[PDB]
Paper text:
Host cell entry is orchestrated by the viral spike protein that, upon binding to ACE2, mediates fusion of the viral membrane with the host membrane. The ectodomain of the heavily glycosylated spike protein forms a trimer where each protomer consists of a core S2 subunit and a distal S1 subunit. Each S1 subunit comprises a receptor-binding domain (RBD) that can switch between an exposed “up” conformation and a “down” conformation, where the latter is inaccessible for ACE2 binding. In particular, sybody 23 (Sb23) binds to recombinant RBD as well as to the prefusion spike glycoprotein with high affinity and shows very potent neutralization activity.
Interestingly, the cryo-EM reconstruction also reveals that the spike bound to Sb23 displays an unusual conformation where two RBDs are in the “up” ACE2-binding conformation. In the pool of particles that enabled a high-resolution reconstruction, approximately half of the particles had one RBD “up” (1-up) and the other half a conformation with two RBDs “up” (2-up). In both main conformations and for both “up” and “down” spike protomers, Sb23 binds in the inner edge of the ACE2 interaction interface of the RBD thereby effectively hindering ACE2 binding. This interprotomer-mediated blockage is true also for the corresponding “up” protomer in the “2-up” conformation but not for the 2nd “up” protomer in this conformation. Hence, even if the blockage of ACE2 binding in the “1-up” conformation from two independent sites may contribute significantly to the efficacy in neutralization by Sb23, the interprotomer-medicated blockage is reduced in the “2-up” conformation. The “2-up” conformation of the spike naturally confers extra avidity with its two binding sites for ACE2. We can at this stage only speculate if the binding of Sb23 itself induces a conformational change that results in the “2-up” conformation or if Sb23 promotes a conformational stabilization of the “2-up” in the spike’s dynamical landscape. Clearly, this conformation makes epitopes accessible for the development of therapeutic binders in the central cavity of the spike, this includes the lower portion of the RBD and possibly also the central helical region.
Author numbering:
A (entry chain A): 299 to 458, 460 to 476, 478 to 518, 521 to 620, 641 to 674, 691 to 694
B (entry chain B): 14 to 70, 76 to 247, 252 to 298
C (entry chain C): 447 to 458, 460 to 476, 478 to 496
């Protein structure tokens, strides 16, 4: 109170100096159940994949996509791209996901990248300069490689440039300049080529299953996992309910919310009750105890004794005397009645030890 | 394949007076025993709404062109659930994505998808005479689709499909809005005991669904069902039904919420000086 | 190509006017225990 009054001498009276408030602890976030999982399981690990020039297109929307499980599996050899990071991606939501899956060779992994040129990057599949998303490649020796020779995979090798994200199912014969009239012979070779993967082939020629995931933005449909936490009551808590952030203590609520209503607002447009999505439970939010602090002194010229009054605070959780004006500490309550000297309030006064 | 239906007499469109209907919850906020003023797209009180009939008595098969300005309030007065579905779009000729909602005999289908929509799409229920069983038999809406983005099919169920005789006993109210790329469909059901009118009183239209579609909608149409037991475009019966279509405008409404939390009554801020 | 200039690429905040001369490996998730491989990459990159 000396600092508050900007003086070293304090006259007898009551002064409001500070404001006691309960700090919030155990911040909690609650989100609805993660029960919308579109089948990501077999889009990456299926029975068989198509050729690189006949890559399949997979459309993903309205899903709850979690990429932490893909990253921490550690069973996938290739994981590297720019624009996005392995962490913090779960907190980013995108409108749509495009998936392109195929099988390439060991040396083909280097060619498939934005800004990189090559025969595959020019005749089979190319990426835009502003590409969003990236590619994941994993070894498939135990599945794609077959003893005796596998020729089910075919890639374009002769072509006259390709637009980004372009599919060319047609494999019309290529002319190098006397026209062959669509007949195999001179100046007209086979435009495609097989792979012929063998078990004896090393890391440079072993098969690799490749999936490219791209995100486009311009309403968002597929978001992150949105993990939740535990629920605790009877404490001043920072709560995050469905993105709504607030501070307060939860308690049992007798209000009956309608099925389509999540949170409730009373008069003056402030949150009063909220229904958590996990267990359809309605809880009343009330602010945790706070209030001003009043310093009662008989004057520095008289004595240095001090009484502390917490205004409208049930200070059972922090010479304690509780009245409807709050709670006073440091003064002995007496059953007598004298003329008021320091007006505390609500019919309660203090005077000089300090008595109330 | 679809064939245009003939034998439909031309009669001027009918307009009917809507009395304190078309009121819905502005948001998902619970309020108890309080007066709240909110500005939103609403249907004005005591307005004029376009009324379409369906009765054998012609046969009064009403599937005309209807624009979609800012939102649609659709009331269906029925005794046998003749109305089937709704279509939303801009071009309606496979060059732009569209939206389709159909409640057939077993499921409910919502497709955000491109269709080669016919000029006269409809449903058809065949009423067998050898045995008593009303079942859907014909569905002439779309031809084919190459691209398609959103599909939703509800759990299978059973429906009556029989045409009862008497006065109307069911009223299905819907509100369709499209704002910020979100399509909101609000629905309510109400029993009635009238022959032809729009019921008075107050009814709060609770929310039903919120699709994150984000497509432009400036044109919508309805889909009914016809009974069968003539030619392909002459031997059909519409069945007794009616539906009212109204347009929503940005208005400020004052709503009273009771202790139950539901909407009790509402007044406008631009209808008459007393309400303002 | 000149590869004598380096910049930090991966790191865990940094106060204003703070110097970080240490280039210890960064773990983004089974820890590699300071060994180059999966779940960890070198934090320095060259402009070239
Ligand atoms: C129903 O009538 C409409 C218009 O009267 C028919 O639409 C015509 O379709 C043909 C071929 O599909 C086009 O060449 C015409 O230009 C269309 N008419 C107009 C005005 O655009 C429609 O084919 C009819 N449905 C039938 C016969 O099943
Ligand atoms: C009502 O519509 C639904 C949705 O199309 C129909 O359910 C599909 O029926 C076809 C044909 O039997 C099946 O191939 C699909 O697998 C069904 N989809 C499901 C079950 O999600 C249903 O058959 C229609 N009902 C009637 C009476 O036509
Ligand atoms: C295949 O990929 C899916 C991705 O959803 C993953 O869950 C699964 O564990 C993988 N299986 C193998 C054998 O790698
Ligand atoms: C959410 O999941 C929990 C755990 O299974 C379950 O107890 C609860 O009923 C679920 N709530 C909803 C709304 O699905
Ligand atoms: C209070 O002030 C008076 C004069 O202002 C002085 O004589 C007296 O000593 C002071 N009290 C104390 C305890 O110092
Ligand atoms: C709040 O104050 C009242 C005084 O009437 C007291 O009985 C009660 O125990 C206090 N609350 C708590 C949690 O201590
Ligand atoms: C309480 O007040 C009564 C009546 O004034 C008095 O007789 C009693 O001694 C008082 N007790 C205490 C502990 O002050
Ligand atoms: C009917 O609707 C029209 C608009 O189409 C409106 O001008 C008119 O006031 C309404 N009422 C009557 C009685 O015509
Ligand atoms: C009985 O009614 C069903 C309609 O649900 C119809 O398909 C069937 O043909 C009828 N039985 C005979 C013998 O016609
Ligand atoms: C389908 O989407 C592709 C992708 O852009 C587009 O080129 C095509 O015009 C769309 N419509 C049809 C009928 O393929
Ligand atoms: C809707 O119309 C606006 C007009 O500015 C256009 O920018 C937008 O691409 C359209 N959206 C669709 C899905 O057609
Ligand atoms: C809620 O509605 C019921 C009737 O369903 C009524 O009895 C009750 O008084 C209303 N108000 C409440 C429960 O606060």
């Amino acid at each position: 109170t000396k600092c508050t009054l900007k003086s070293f001498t304090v006259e007898k009276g009551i002064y409001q100096t500070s404001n006691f408030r309960v700090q919030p602890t155990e911040s909690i976030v609650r989100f609805p159940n993660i029960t919308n999982l579109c089948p990501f399981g077999e889009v990456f690990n299926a029975t068989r994949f198509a050729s690189v020039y006949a890559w399949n297109r997979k459309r993903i929307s309205n899903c709850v996509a979690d990429y932490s499980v893909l990253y921490n599996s550690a069973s996938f050899s290739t994981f590297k791209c720019y624009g996005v990071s392995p962490t913090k991606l779960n907190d980013l939501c995108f409108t749509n996901v495009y998936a392109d899956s195929f099988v390439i060779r060991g040396d083909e992994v280097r060619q498939i990248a934005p800004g990189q040129t090559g025969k595959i990057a020019d005749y089979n599949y190319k990426l835009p300069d502003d590409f969003t998303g990236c590619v994941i490649a994993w070894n498939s020796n135990n599945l794609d490689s077959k003893v005796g020779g596998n020729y089910n995979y075919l890639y374009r090798l002769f072509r006259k440039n390709l637009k980004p994200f372009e599919r060319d199912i047609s494999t019309e014969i290529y002319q190098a300049g006397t026209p062959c009239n669509g007949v195999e012979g001179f100046n007209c070779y086979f435009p495609l080529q097989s792979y012929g993967f063998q078990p004896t082939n090393g890391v440079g020629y072993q098969p690799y299953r490749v999936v490219v995931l791209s995100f486009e933005l311009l309403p968002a449909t597929v978001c992150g996992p949105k993990k939740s936490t535990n629920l605790v009551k009877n404490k001043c808590v920072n709560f995050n309910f469905n993105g709504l952030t607030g501070t307060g203590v939860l308690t049992e609520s007798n209000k009956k919310f309608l099925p389509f209503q999540q949170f409730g607002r009373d008069i003056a447009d402030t949150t009063d009750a909220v229904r958590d999505p996990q267990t359809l439970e309605i809880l009343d939010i009330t602010p945790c105890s706070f209030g001003g602090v009043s310093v009662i002194t008989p004057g520095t010229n008289t004595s240095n004794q001090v009484a502390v009054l917490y205004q409208d605070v049930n200070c059972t959780e922090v010479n304690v005397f509780q009245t409807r004006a709050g709670c006073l500490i440091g003064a002995e309550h007496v059953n007598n009645s004298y003329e008021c000297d320091i007006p505390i309030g609500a019919g309660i006064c203090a005077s000089y030890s300090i008595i109330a | 394949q679809c064939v245009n239906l003939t034998t439909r007499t031309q009669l001027p469109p009918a307009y009917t007076n809507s009395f304190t209907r078309g009121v819905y919850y502005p948001d998902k906020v619970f309020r108890s025993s309080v007066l709240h003023s909110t500005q939103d797209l609403f249907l004005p009180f005591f307005s004029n709404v376009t009324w379409f009939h369906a009765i054998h008595v012609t046969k009064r098969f009403d599937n005309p062109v209807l624009p979609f300005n800012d939102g649609v309030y659709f009331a269906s007065t029925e005794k046998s659930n003749i109305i089937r579905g709704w279509i939303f779009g801009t071009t309606l000729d496979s060059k732009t994505q569209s939206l389709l909602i159909v409640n057939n005999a077993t499921n409910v289908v919502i497709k955000v998808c491109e269709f080669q929509f016919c000029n006269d799409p409809f449903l058809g229920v065949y009423y067998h005479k050898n045995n008593k069983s009303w079942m859907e038999s014909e569905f002439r809406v779309y031809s084919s689709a190459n691209n398609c983005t959103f599909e939703y099919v509800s759990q299978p169920f059973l429906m009556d499909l029989e045409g009862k005789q008497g006065n109307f006993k069911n009223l299905r109210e819907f509100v369709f809005k499209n704002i910020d790329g979100y399509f909101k469909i609000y629905s309510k059901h109400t029993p009635i005991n009238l022959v032809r009118d729009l019921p008075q009183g107050f009814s709060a239209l609770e929310p039903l669904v919120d699709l994150p579609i984000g497509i432009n909608i400036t044109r919508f149409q309805t889909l009914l069902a016809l009974h069968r037991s003539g030619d392909s475009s002459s031997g059909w019966t519409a069945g007794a039904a009616a539906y009212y279509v109204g347009y929503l405008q940005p208005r400020t409404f004052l709503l009273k919420y009771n202790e139950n939390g539901t909407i009790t009554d509402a007044v406008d801020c631009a209808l008459d000086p007393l309400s303002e």
